[PDB]
Design a protein around this motif. Structure first.
Motif, PDB file in Angstrom:
ATOM      1  N   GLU A 245       0.787  -1.235   0.000  1.00 20.97           N
ATOM      2  CA  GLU A 245       0.000   0.000   0.000  1.00 20.97           C
ATOM      3  C   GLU A 245       0.814   1.277   0.000  1.00 20.97           C
ATOM      4  O   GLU A 245       0.608   2.180  -0.821  1.00 20.97           O
ATOM      5  CB  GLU A 245      -0.897   0.043   1.267  1.00 20.97           C
ATOM      6  N   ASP A 246       1.884   1.358   0.797  1.00 20.06           N
ATOM      7  CA  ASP A 246       2.735   2.536   0.839  1.00 20.06           C
ATOM      8  C   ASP A 246       3.382   2.669  -0.531  1.00 20.06           C
ATOM      9  O   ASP A 246       3.491   3.824  -0.981  1.00 20.06           O
ATOM     10  CB  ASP A 246       3.817   2.498   1.908  1.00 20.06           C
ATOM     11  N   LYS A 247       3.931   1.597  -1.096  1.00 22.39           N
ATOM     12  CA  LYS A 247       4.642   1.680  -2.385  1.00 22.39           C
ATOM     13  C   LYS A 247       3.717   2.132  -3.507  1.00 22.39           C
ATOM     14  O   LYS A 247       4.076   2.857  -4.476  1.00 22.39           O
ATOM     15  CB  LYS A 247       5.363   0.363  -2.693  1.00 22.39           C
ATOM     16  N   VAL A 248       2.474   1.684  -3.428  1.00 21.53           N
ATOM     17  CA  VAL A 248       1.448   2.102  -4.402  1.00 21.53           C
ATOM     18  C   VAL A 248       1.270   3.620  -4.292  1.00 21.53           C
ATOM     19  O   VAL A 248       1.211   4.273  -5.333  1.00 21.53           O
ATOM     20  CB  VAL A 248       0.138   1.328  -4.215  1.00 21.53           C
ATOM     21  N   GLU A 249       1.086   4.167  -3.096  1.00 20.80           N
ATOM     22  CA  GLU A 249       0.938   5.608  -2.886  1.00 20.80           C
ATOM     23  C   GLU A 249       2.177   6.329  -3.420  1.00 20.80           C
ATOM     24  O   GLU A 249       1.998   7.341  -4.093  1.00 20.80           O
ATOM     25  CB  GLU A 249       0.756   5.924  -1.395  1.00 20.80           C
ATOM     26  N   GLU A 250       3.341   5.744  -3.121  1.00 14.02           N
ATOM     27  CA  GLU A 250       4.599   6.353  -3.641  1.00 14.02           C
ATOM     28  C   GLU A 250       4.444   6.518  -5.137  1.00 14.02           C
ATOM     29  O   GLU A 250       4.635   7.592  -5.757  1.00 14.02           O
ATOM     30  CB  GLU A 250       5.763   5.410  -3.354  1.00 14.02           C
ATOM     31  N   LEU A 251       4.137   5.417  -5.814  1.00 12.43           N
ATOM     32  CA  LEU A 251       4.018   5.322  -7.257  1.00 12.43           C
ATOM     33  C   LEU A 251       3.012   6.261  -7.895  1.00 12.43           C
ATOM     34  O   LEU A 251       3.283   6.924  -8.901  1.00 12.43           O
ATOM     35  CB  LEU A 251       3.694   3.883  -7.671  1.00 12.43           C
ATOM     36  N   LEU A 252       1.830   6.357  -7.242  1.00 12.60           N
ATOM     37  CA  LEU A 252       0.769   7.183  -7.761  1.00 12.60           C
ATOM     38  C   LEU A 252       1.182   8.667  -7.684  1.00 12.60           C
ATOM     39  O   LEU A 252       0.989   9.388  -8.646  1.00 12.60           O
ATOM     40  CB  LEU A 252      -0.530   6.962  -7.004  1.00 12.60           C
ATOM     41  N   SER A 253       1.879   9.016  -6.614  1.00 15.13           N
ATOM     42  CA  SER A 253       2.283  10.434  -6.514  1.00 15.13           C
ATOM     43  C   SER A 253       3.312  10.669  -7.630  1.00 15.13           C
ATOM     44  O   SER A 253       3.291  11.745  -8.245  1.00 15.13           O
ATOM     45  CB  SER A 253       2.743  10.660  -5.081  1.00 15.13           C
ATOM     46  N   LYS A 254       4.262   9.849  -7.779  1.00 13.86           N
ATOM     47  CA  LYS A 254       5.297   9.876  -8.863  1.00 13.86           C
ATOM     48  C   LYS A 254       4.604  10.019 -10.204  1.00 13.86           C
ATOM     49  O   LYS A 254       4.967  10.885 -11.040  1.00 13.86           O
ATOM     50  CB  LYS A 254       6.258   8.702  -8.829  1.00 13.86           C
ATOM     51  N   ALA A 255       3.676   9.108 -10.526  1.00 15.18           N
ATOM     52  CA  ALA A 255       2.953   9.211 -11.798  1.00 15.18           C
ATOM     53  C   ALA A 255       2.146  10.486 -12.002  1.00 15.18           C
ATOM     54  O   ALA A 255       2.216  11.077 -13.096  1.00 15.18           O
ATOM     55  CB  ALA A 255       2.085   7.928 -11.871  1.00 15.18           C
ATOM     56  N   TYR A 256       1.541  11.113 -10.992  1.00 14.74           N
ATOM     57  CA  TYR A 256       0.862  12.377 -11.146  1.00 14.74           C
ATOM     58  C   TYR A 256       1.900  13.467 -11.427  1.00 14.74           C
ATOM     59  O   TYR A 256       1.661  14.202 -12.397  1.00 14.74           O
ATOM     60  CB  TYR A 256       0.060  12.772  -9.914  1.00 14.74           C
ATOM     61  N   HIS A 257       2.983  13.429 -10.676  1.00 14.99           N
ATOM     62  CA  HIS A 257       4.057  14.408 -10.960  1.00 14.99           C
ATOM     63  C   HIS A 257       4.599  14.340 -12.389  1.00 14.99           C
ATOM     64  O   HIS A 257       4.683  15.359 -13.140  1.00 14.99           O
ATOM     65  CB  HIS A 257       5.146  14.195  -9.895  1.00 14.99           C
ATOM     66  N   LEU A 258       4.740  13.135 -12.934  1.00 11.64           N
ATOM     67  CA  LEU A 258       5.160  12.873 -14.321  1.00 11.64           C
ATOM     68  C   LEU A 258       4.159  13.355 -15.362  1.00 11.64           C
ATOM     69  O   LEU A 258       4.436  14.172 -16.221  1.00 11.64           O
ATOM     70  CB  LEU A 258       5.439  11.386 -14.584  1.00 11.64           C
ATOM     71  N   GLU A 259       2.881  13.125 -14.991  1.00 12.24           N
ATOM     72  CA  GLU A 259       1.751  13.596 -15.762  1.00 12.24           C
ATOM     73  C   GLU A 259       1.771  15.121 -15.858  1.00 12.24           C
ATOM     74  O   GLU A 259       1.686  15.627 -16.976  1.00 12.24           O
ATOM     75  CB  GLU A 259       0.400  13.133 -15.234  1.00 12.24           C
ATOM     76  N   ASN A 260       2.129  15.813 -14.787  1.00 12.71           N
ATOM     77  CA  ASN A 260       2.147  17.257 -14.733  1.00 12.71           C
ATOM     78  C   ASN A 260       3.406  17.778 -15.438  1.00 12.71           C
ATOM     79  O   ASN A 260       3.206  18.688 -16.274  1.00 12.71           O
ATOM     80  CB  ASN A 260       2.092  17.873 -13.366  1.00 12.71           C
ATOM     81  N   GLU A 261       4.542  17.124 -15.343  1.00 10.61           N
ATOM     82  CA  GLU A 261       5.786  17.453 -16.051  1.00 10.61           C
ATOM     83  C   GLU A 261       5.641  17.307 -17.555  1.00 10.61           C
ATOM     84  O   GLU A 261       6.053  18.203 -18.320  1.00 10.61           O
ATOM     85  CB  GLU A 261       6.970  16.612 -15.534  1.00 10.61           C
ATOM     86  N   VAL A 262       4.980  16.218 -18.008  1.00  9.94           N
ATOM     87  CA  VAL A 262       4.732  16.029 -19.417  1.00  9.94           C
ATOM     88  C   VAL A 262       3.958  17.246 -19.954  1.00  9.94           C
ATOM     89  O   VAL A 262       4.243  17.690 -21.066  1.00  9.94           O
ATOM     90  CB  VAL A 262       4.072  14.660 -19.749  1.00  9.94           C
ATOM     91  N   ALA A 263       2.836  17.578 -19.307  1.00  7.88           N
ATOM     92  CA  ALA A 263       2.082  18.760 -19.693  1.00  7.88           C
ATOM     93  C   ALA A 263       2.983  19.988 -19.761  1.00  7.88           C
ATOM     94  O   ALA A 263       2.805  20.768 -20.704  1.00  7.88           O
ATOM     95  CB  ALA A 263       0.994  18.997 -18.650  1.00  7.88           C
ATOM     96  N   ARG A 264       3.836  20.232 -18.796  1.00  4.28           N
ATOM     97  CA  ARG A 264       4.712  21.390 -18.721  1.00  4.28           C
ATOM     98  C   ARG A 264       5.684  21.412 -19.928  1.00  4.28           C
ATOM     99  O   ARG A 264       5.704  22.398 -20.681  1.00  4.28           O
ATOM    100  CB  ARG A 264       5.503  21.394 -17.427  1.00  4.28           C
ATOM    101  N   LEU A 265       6.281  20.297 -20.182  1.00  7.51           N
ATOM    102  CA  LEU A 265       7.125  20.097 -21.381  1.00  7.51           C
ATOM    103  C   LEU A 265       6.430  20.277 -22.692  1.00  7.51           C
ATOM    104  O   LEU A 265       7.007  20.903 -23.647  1.00  7.51           O
ATOM    105  CB  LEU A 265       7.791  18.728 -21.375  1.00  7.51           C
ATOM    106  N   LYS A 266       5.241  19.717 -22.935  1.00  8.10           N
ATOM    107  CA  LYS A 266       4.484  19.893 -24.179  1.00  8.10           C
ATOM    108  C   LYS A 266       4.381  21.380 -24.558  1.00  8.10           C
ATOM    109  O   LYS A 266       4.717  21.776 -25.658  1.00  8.10           O
ATOM    110  CB  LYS A 266       3.101  19.254 -24.030  1.00  8.10           C
ATOM    111  N   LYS A 267       3.970  22.164 -23.580  1.00 10.70           N
ATOM    112  CA  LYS A 267       3.902  23.605 -23.605  1.00 10.70           C
ATOM    113  C   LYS A 267       5.266  24.183 -23.956  1.00 10.70           C
ATOM    114  O   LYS A 267       5.327  24.953 -24.924  1.00 10.70           O
ATOM    115  CB  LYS A 267       3.369  24.184 -22.291  1.00 10.70           C
ATOM    116  N   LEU A 268       6.326  23.924 -23.207  1.00 11.41           N
ATOM    117  CA  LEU A 268       7.677  24.409 -23.503  1.00 11.41           C
ATOM    118  C   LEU A 268       8.127  24.086 -24.924  1.00 11.41           C
ATOM    119  O   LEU A 268       8.864  24.911 -25.490  1.00 11.41           O
ATOM    120  CB  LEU A 268       8.643  23.873 -22.453  1.00 11.41           C
ATOM    121  N   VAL A 269       7.798  22.983 -25.560  1.00 14.55           N
ATOM    122  CA  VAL A 269       8.220  22.624 -26.929  1.00 14.55           C
ATOM    123  C   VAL A 269       7.504  23.511 -27.940  1.00 14.55           C
ATOM    124  O   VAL A 269       8.067  24.016 -28.910  1.00 14.55           O
ATOM    125  CB  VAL A 269       7.888  21.139 -27.226  1.00 14.55           C
ATOM    126  N   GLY A 270       6.258  23.848 -27.600  1.00 14.22           N
ATOM    127  CA  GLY A 270       5.423  24.747 -28.374  1.00 14.22           C
ATOM    128  C   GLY A 270       4.513  23.944 -29.294  1.00 14.22           C
ATOM    129  O   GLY A 270       4.996  23.129 -30.065  1.00 14.22           O
TER     130      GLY A 270
END
Lengths: 31, 29, 31
Positions: free
Chosen positions: C6-31
């Motif tokens: 359960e803890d590792k799952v929570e770790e993972l889900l937070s990681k994946a949301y952060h990645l999801e938000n970074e991807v969005a940030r990058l898409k924008k930066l590429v134009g």
């Protein structure tokens, strides 16, 4: 099944790990 | 695009795993 | 065992949301 899910969270944390690495490289590349 | 698709995949695999884990939880307590 | 999975799952889900938000940030930066 307990071992199956423990092996799955490790696999996905490994993947996260490498993706975070790629994010860092993309950030450098897009300057 | 390659990174978008892998994060898309990660997100689906992690949500699926979360559901399975929650099910396993019911069995184990 | 259970609480560690359960803890590792929570770790993972937070990681994946952060990645999801970074991807969005990058898409924008590429134009």
């Amino acid at each position: 099944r307990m071992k199956q899910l423990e092996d799955k969270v490790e696999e996905l944390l490994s993947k996260a790990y490498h993706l975070e690495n790629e994010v860092a490289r993309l950030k450098k590349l897009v300057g």
